Design a protein around this ligand. Sequence first.
Ligand SMILES: Nc1ncnc2c1ncn2[C@@H]1O[C@H](COP(=O)(O)OP(=O)(O)O)[C@@H](O)[C@H]1O
Ligand SMILES: Nc1ncnc2c1ncn2[C@@H]1O[C@H](COP(=O)(O)OP(=O)(O)O)[C@@H](O)[C@H]1O
Ligand SMILES: Nc1ncnc2c1ncn2[C@@H]1O[C@H](COP(=O)(O)OP(=O)(O)O)[C@@H](O)[C@H]1O
Ligand SMILES: Nc1ncnc2c1ncn2[C@@H]1O[C@H](COP(=O)(O)OP(=O)(O)O)[C@@H](O)[C@H]1O
Ligand SMILES: Nc1ncnc2c1ncn2[C@@H]1O[C@H](COP(=O)(O)OP(=O)(O)O)[C@@H](O)[C@H]1O
Ligand code: BEF
Ligand code: BEF
Ligand code: BEF
Ligand SMILES: [Mg+2]
Ligand SMILES: [Mg+2]
Ligand SMILES: [Mg+2]
Lengths: 311, 311, 311, 312, 308, 302
Amino acid sequence: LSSAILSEKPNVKWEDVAGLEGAKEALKEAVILPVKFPHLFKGNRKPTSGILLYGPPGTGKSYLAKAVATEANSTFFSVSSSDLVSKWMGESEKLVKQLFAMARENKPSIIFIDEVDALTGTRGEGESEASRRIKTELLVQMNGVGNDSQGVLVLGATNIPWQLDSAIRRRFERRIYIPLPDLAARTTMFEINVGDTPCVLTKEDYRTLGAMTEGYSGSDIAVVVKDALMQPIRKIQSATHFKDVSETRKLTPCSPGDDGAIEMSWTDIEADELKEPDLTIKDFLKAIKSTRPTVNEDDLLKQEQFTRDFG
Amino acid sequence: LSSAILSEKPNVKWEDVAGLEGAKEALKEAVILPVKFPHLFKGNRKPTSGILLYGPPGTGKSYLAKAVATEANSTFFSVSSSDLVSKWMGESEKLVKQLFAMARENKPSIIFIDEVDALTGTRGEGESEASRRIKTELLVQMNGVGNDSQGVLVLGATNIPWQLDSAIRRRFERRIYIPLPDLAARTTMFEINVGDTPCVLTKEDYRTLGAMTEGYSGSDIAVVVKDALMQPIRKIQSATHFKDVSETRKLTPCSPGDDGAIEMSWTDIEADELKEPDLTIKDFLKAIKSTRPTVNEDDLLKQEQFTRDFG
Amino acid sequence: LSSAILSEKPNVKWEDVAGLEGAKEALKEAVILPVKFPHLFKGNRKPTSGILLYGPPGTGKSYLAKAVATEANSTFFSVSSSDLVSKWMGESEKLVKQLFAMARENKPSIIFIDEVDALTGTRGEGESEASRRIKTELLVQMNGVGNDSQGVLVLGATNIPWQLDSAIRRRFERRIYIPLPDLAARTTMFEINVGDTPCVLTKEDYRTLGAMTEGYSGSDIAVVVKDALMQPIRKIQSATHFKDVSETRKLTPCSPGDDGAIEMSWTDIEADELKEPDLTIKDFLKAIKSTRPTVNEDDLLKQEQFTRDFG
Amino acid sequence: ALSSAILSEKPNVKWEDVAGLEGAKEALKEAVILPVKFPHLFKGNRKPTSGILLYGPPGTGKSYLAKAVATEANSTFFSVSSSDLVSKWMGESEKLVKQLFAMARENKPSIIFIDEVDALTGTRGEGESEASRRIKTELLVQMNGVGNDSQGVLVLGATNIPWQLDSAIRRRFERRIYIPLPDLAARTTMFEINVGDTPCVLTKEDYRTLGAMTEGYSGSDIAVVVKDALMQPIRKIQSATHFKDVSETRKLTPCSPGDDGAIEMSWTDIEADELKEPDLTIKDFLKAIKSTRPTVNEDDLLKQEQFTRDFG
Amino acid sequence: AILSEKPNVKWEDVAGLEGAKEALKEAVILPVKFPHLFKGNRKPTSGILLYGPPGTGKSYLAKAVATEANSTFFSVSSSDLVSKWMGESEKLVKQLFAMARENKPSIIFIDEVDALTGTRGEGESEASRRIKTELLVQMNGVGNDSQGVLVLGATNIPWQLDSAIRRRFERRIYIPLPDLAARTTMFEINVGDTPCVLTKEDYRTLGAMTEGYSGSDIAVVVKDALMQPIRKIQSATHFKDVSETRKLTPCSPGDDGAIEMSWTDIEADELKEPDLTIKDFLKAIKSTRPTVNEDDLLKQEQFTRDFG
Amino acid sequence: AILSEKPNVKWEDVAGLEGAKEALKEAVILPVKFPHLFKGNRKPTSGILLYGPPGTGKSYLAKAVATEANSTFFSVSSSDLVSKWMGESEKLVKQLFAMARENKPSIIFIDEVDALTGTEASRRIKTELLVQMNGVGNDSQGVLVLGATNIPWQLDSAIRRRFERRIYIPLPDLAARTTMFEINVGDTPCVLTKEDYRTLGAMTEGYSGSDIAVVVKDALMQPIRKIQSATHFKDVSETRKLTPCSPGDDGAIEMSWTDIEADELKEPDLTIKDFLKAIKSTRPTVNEDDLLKQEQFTRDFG
Ligand SMILES: Nc1ncnc2c1ncn2[C@@H]1O[C@H](COP(=O)(O)OP(=O)(O)O)[C@@H](O)[C@H]1O
Ligand SMILES: Nc1ncnc2c1ncn2[C@@H]1O[C@H](COP(=O)(O)OP(=O)(O)O)[C@@H](O)[C@H]1O
Ligand SMILES: Nc1ncnc2c1ncn2[C@@H]1O[C@H](COP(=O)(O)OP(=O)(O)O)[C@@H](O)[C@H]1O
Ligand SMILES: Nc1ncnc2c1ncn2[C@@H]1O[C@H](COP(=O)(O)OP(=O)(O)O)[C@@H](O)[C@H]1O
Ligand SMILES: Nc1ncnc2c1ncn2[C@@H]1O[C@H](COP(=O)(O)OP(=O)(O)O)[C@@H](O)[C@H]1O
Ligand code: BEF
Ligand code: BEF
Ligand code: BEF
Ligand SMILES: [Mg+2]
Ligand SMILES: [Mg+2]
Ligand SMILES: [Mg+2]
């Protein structure tokens, strides 16, 4: 049997995710509003049962699922494609039945599924038995004869929504496209991902950054901020020569031959008594020259096709 | 001989389904007429043994099965593809035999199977042992040597009727296509799904709605009515400011600066003593602009192919 | 000691089967002629041991098996694929051995197997242990070292005879194709399936019906006759108005305003004392417009392939 | 004390009833008759054959030849399918094999027949190599025992699928023989055998005309066209209206409407025995030839020429 | 089912391409040397890809990272991951990252990740979607602790690697063909304790002769060289005394003291093996062609020139 | 499941293969003959793979090595390990190495090493074997593993790598086939000359020892075959003795073997020509594309 139970909460708050307030609105009214205000949702007025998120890779879908998982205050299940597909013949499907069953047992609950494109695609006869049996149980077990469709919430994610079948497209009754973040949201993600590190710039300088970075993803922002945090490490471990500055001794990397320039390596230098140089904009522009964006623009044209129709 | 079964207690009545009068006629004469009038069915006049329902997703198939399940007054079995396919080798087929066996034990009765496409498809050799053994037992056990084909009524549903094998197609001896609905039925579903909520419109305004919504499904109607029932709380949480109107205190969202406009949030306001905004066409039309028709039209061309031939 | 025996008593006459005079000849000489005339079969002259029937679905195969079962006057066994395939490892095969064993114990006897395609197909290694063990025991136990092949009789049915393996094809030594019925046989099935219901037509009108219905199955005939028997219930409970005609009170549906036309519903009318208008030609033609032929014509080309070779 | 179910009674078929098979007839006469009649020849270097396989397309006469050996044995003829070897729990699946060859050596001289050896063997994955690899392994040892027990037993293998037979058991059956479809003269012989004691109408060259008409059948095809030929005069008895006396007191046969002594009646009207059936005529034979096209397929013959062309 | 080892390989054991060396010394040794620098915004690298032509020592360098790591160093090829059944192909991935998190702090190596990528099109459908999907979501996802474990990827085909897994391996390093001096160093290492015959500039002549090999190519020409004088001894007729009591070596037919015999004829020890010298080396260089191809190097310069 | 023996097969009992033989002599016998040669970091081979087409008696050659190294021969079939024993196979591979350690000098023979790898469960056998072949180090001295494969190209590269030395076992050449015919008839009464044996040799290009063994087993029975079927008996020469002869000959009576008295039959003498018959009715076992497939392996992993 083994009951396939998996549920754990990380820490990602609301405003960690920047921008796209339609999805924030729909998920606050789909998650917080049923739990905090159950009396409003009564009779004809019912909460949303199936919500699909989609878009290009790294626009913040699974991180938003993390934010819902932290801000849930509910039995947050989560399952990959691993725990559903079993060995023999029968546990591949009865575990789905027990998943939504015990999900309804621990109601109010939220279910997230990542990359539902691995379970769809009934057109043709490829991926035959797994697609028909497992996908059929996802349909009928999602709603069907005597399933309590109230209670639980099914969060779907994908990168390919056009290969998603129209029936499961109707199952995910409120679908939301997640675009590449605009100027202001990327300004916000810059001001978030700098964090507690002492920066040097102002808000309109972050606006200059977001103007320079037209058309990235969230991971692209995470790695240009990472590289911006990782240039002074290369300055400290780099080359030969440090120097004292200023609570008892403190040395930082400096060029060969300078005011107090001893010749050494980071290894030579004592615990703590290292001075790493500030973060800097030059670090930002160096990170811009480091990495090209990952997303392709014809795939964005297909996202504008399915979004322009069904979004 | 360990038997694992199930049964239901649903709640759906006749007038909730709009249109579909042929299916309503065939199921009233296939369900109500045998039980209420058993004396009419004698000798040459025999009840229907196999009924197929099919069509695009969300035209009301499984909800009609709910209506038959409530209006049955009979032992209503229902089985998905899960409970038939077993682990080892033998219980995958003997459970089918015990299903129709105990179904004949509790006669008169109705059996529903959802998404029978997971049990068909003998063409080729894919899904070999499960398809031949389980599907063979569905054929022979459905009717065969000494099966009492009288009594139990088998209601079939699917979304893919062309992959259904011709033998089971003959088993479901009276098949009915369920098209996309029309103007008047969607007017009826609007006037049903508004329910007890105090609306604002008239009947010809619902006709204007159904004229605006050419080519939806029933789920599309359910979610535009759902979104229409969410715009009140969207207005309550909107901005800063509520106001008393009118059984002891009752406040609703209003614009900044109005007759009795206090400044607050929904959180500030007491249990129940919240007032909800009246349904207006603007919420309806906003919900129409929110969501495209879900299903495609080339799939409708294939439904017109199989319907135009075999319907 | 397993003892998974089952047999029964149906009721189907010879002459309720239409067409198929070759199958009628082969089964009269295979069933009636051994029992009534055992002295003719002695020494070199031996009865037939294996007879196969095949064809498109609903050409009357299993109903002919019902007719043999009624007209047997012999211990008629019948087994599906369910009772042969067991759980563990050994009872899947020893039950076959006990089946032909106790079949020879109750000689003279007839064995029918429906849809033998679930036990064949040794080509490749799919369905490996069940196919090799169970099918091997079907071969050797059917005839082999010391099996008394005289006595019993193995009746095979299928819908797919080309996937039947050539060895079992040789086992079923006298195979018969069962086509779609022609004009006269469908005229006969019309005149049988009208039964005791008072009709309105003549024999050449049934010839007009069979001319209108070119290329049906037996189930198609059964459901157009069924729909023809379900039109007078629709008319007797349709709209408003019945009328007395003629053993104490008897009312039938009639148009609004007629000779003795009271206004009521079927519900208003007393047990029995309600009679529906006799089947009419229009009901027949309406049933012809109701339902397509079931079978497809490329499958008929494969039936002409296997029939043209092995028939 | 976990013994089995064996053969005791032999099914009487004569040695002359088969046709063709001259290599198999030679190998089994030298493998059965020659050890018993001449034990002094097999000594030292000269040893009898230990493993003999028969194979071929279905219905070329393999199991019927095993019937002929079973009648002509005069020895304790065991026979076992795949049923009696595979047991329930874990251990009797293999100890019964050990007791089979054990009690087979107890009742020596003796012959062992195994039909459909591909059901014994056959591995694809983990499920196929469980509880069949054990029994296969015990067969592997107990037929490695040629150096242990050369004299005594003989293992006759039959199959229809010899390519799925594993190469190790292929080496165990050390002298394998392909059994093809029969030719003109052998089918003439099977016609003249299967007519039996029934009074025929034809001559030997008419049977040659039959075998020329029936190019490429099996033995079962011959058995059913002869069977249908033995059903045609009773079909004449059932058919039409009208019989007629001919010739030990009254004897009537079917004849056309209006003939020399043509009374009008049905078979039902006619007294026990005093019926006369029509003698088999070439027309019933040729009608039976038109009734059933050959059963086996020629691509299967190409695979028999593959395995025969290699390992035959 | 799952392998583990703390191997021998050191940074000085590795010869060549010191930018990848200092990069892995940073991303692996810097969590070891200064874990207290990595806090809050400053986080260690999670996914590092190595790639290029075959035989360049990526697994060997991973073993150098393993020895200087002091951590549970896993390593897996594709052979422990290919679908034989329909679902130990995926649950073993789940147990791999699961037990990898059980033995944290840890390092995971995967060799030739090109056998798990390539979602474009529908070829290799169920294995690619299921197994690759679990690699993505299980690599980072809803509630995966992405901290801790380190995923080392290797391949020979990086362009067929999908862009999503390309982003997963967030710090990728191209490994080019090495140079003269590093192959001189690998010659002087792989000769080992065997008594050679040459000097350092003769190894420079060797590396000049061997322009454009891999590390495995060096390993097999040194291996064949450790068959070469033994191949002289196993060959031919005639030995000869030279010089602690009797000592004979192979010599040509007809020479100063050339007796005719075989090695078998000659007494324990009292054999004088031919010296190990270059003609055998240069003959081994003429024996074997470089395996790798240069248009594949042009594609490595394409993907490296763009994304490197 | 594990066979053990102190075999008695000399080099001369193994037809041909002189090249392998000479490789094995210096690979295995030299270390054993003069152990003082292998002090310090100089260590004798401890894995040898024997590869080549089936029917060359790789096993028999292996026993000769054991006989000549004066060692116990321990042996196991990998097919049996993978299928028959399964569950207990880890235990078996253990015990096997354990016996061999306890019994130095000794040799482990693993037949069909390819059959260790693929078509989870036998992944254990692979894994245990590898751990054990690392046993040269815990106990490097005194044991040697000889693997045998017909399909070296299907042999797990990890296992492959544990077999330092690889030796090709070719199909027999003229001289070897000639020896095989002689050995296979041994003492049997026949009238074959030295030249006939050579002829039989020359006439079986591409045959294996196995193939030759079956042909010879077939041929020797021919005189028994003639006597059993024999027709027309003529007297020759201890009181009456008749043999088959053609229709119409010096003393040619017409009869069948059945007609002739116990013993007083003279069976036909063995002939070189008769084997020629047997050669026609037994095709060689081994496909001709195997040469290349095996030589591809000699080129790549030799
Ligand atoms: N709006 C956002 N605010 C903060 N972090 C973000 C945002 N969007 C993306 N990220 C970063 O992206 C990563 C998660 O991406 P994910 O949603 O898993 O990609 P995908 O959408 O392809 O699943 C996290 O490291 C997170 O920090
Ligand atoms: N005609 C209809 N009348 C009332 N509700 C409907 C109708 N069509 C659809 N619905 C609603 O939409 C959903 C879809 O109906 P259902 O029979 O379950 O279709 P499906 O199984 O194809 O999704 C149901 O949950 C039901 O509440
Ligand atoms: N020739 C026929 N005569 C009478 N009824 C028939 C005939 N063919 C079919 N039927 C009717 O149609 C149905 C289908 O025939 P049946 O033998 O059950 O088909 P199948 O062999 O495919 O199961 C049966 O209910 C039978 O009564
Ligand atoms: N040579 C033959 N002579 C006479 N009858 C034969 C011959 N070969 C086959 N038959 C008949 O054909 C049938 C098949 O013979 P058999 O060996 O049992 O074949 P199988 O087991 O493949 O069905 C039997 O009824 C047998 O009487
Ligand atoms: N840069 C290097 N320094 C030292 N040895 C190397 C180097 N590159 C390759 N080698 C040698 O090559 C052998 C095999 O290299 P391998 O790790 O298989 O290459 P790959 O990068 O394809 O995995 C190793 O045993 C190693 O000793
Ligand atoms: F989803 Be429905 F049953 F087409
Ligand atoms: F149902 Be039938 F036998 F095609
Ligand atoms: F013996 Be047969 F080929 F069934
Ligand atoms: Mg449904
Ligand atoms: Mg049927
Ligand atoms: Mg047989």
